[PDB]
Amino acid sequence: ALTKAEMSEYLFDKLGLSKRDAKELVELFFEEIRRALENGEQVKLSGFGNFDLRDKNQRPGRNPKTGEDIPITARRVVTFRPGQKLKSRVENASPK
DNA sequence: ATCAATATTTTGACTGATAGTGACCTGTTCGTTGCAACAAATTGATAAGCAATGCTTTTTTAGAATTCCAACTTATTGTAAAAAAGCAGGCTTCAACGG
């Protein structure tokens, strides 16, 4: 699984950047994105996807184990709509 | 031409920088490690994305024009002694107007 460790190492052998800043950029990368989502801003990354924010209302739910119907509290989640470019590169993938 | 005193002739004390290694402190990097975070697994009513593909709107894109940055290659131009006037910063007196 791709981790921040592998991402930093990549920037070291592709951009020749020290692992230090290579590890600091990967952190600030996801950080800045999370700061935009929490602030209520859409994140549109061309050639990748789009992190949307939809306010879901309180809908009926339950306890998957027993079956006790419990109303799922409303909350703002963070969806991800992959671009057409990304889909065309993952359409022919393979779980490995 | 020889006394006699002061600047002269090498050494030593004075005071903090010069010299080069070493300890001090801890960012920074790497190995050991703990733990919040992530993933599998349920069950079932309700919400969101989905197949194709040309036209329209929004965002990223590769130059290319433009102008300061820059190491070179040209294009023109060229004065000083020797006098002897020409101006203002402030203290100095005569000459005209008013009591």
UniProtKB/Swiss-Prot annotation:
> Region (Disordered): which ranges?
48-72
Under InterPro entries, the record lists: Hist_DNA-bd, Histone-like_DNA-bd_CS, IHF-like_DNA-bd_dom_sf, IHF_alpha
Keywords, in A-Z order: DNA recombination, DNA-binding, Transcription, Transcription regulation, Translation regulation
Gene Ontology terms for molecular function: DNA binding; structural constituent of chromatin
So which domain of life are we looking at? Bacteria
Assembly and partners are described as: Heterodimer of an alpha and a beta chain.
For this chain, the family text in UniProt reads:
Belongs to the bacterial histone-like protein family.
The protein, known as: Integration host factor subunit alpha
**What is the organism lineage in this UniProt record?**
Bacteria, Pseudomonadati, Pseudomonadota, Gammaproteobacteria, Enterobacterales
State the gene name recorded for this protein: ihfA
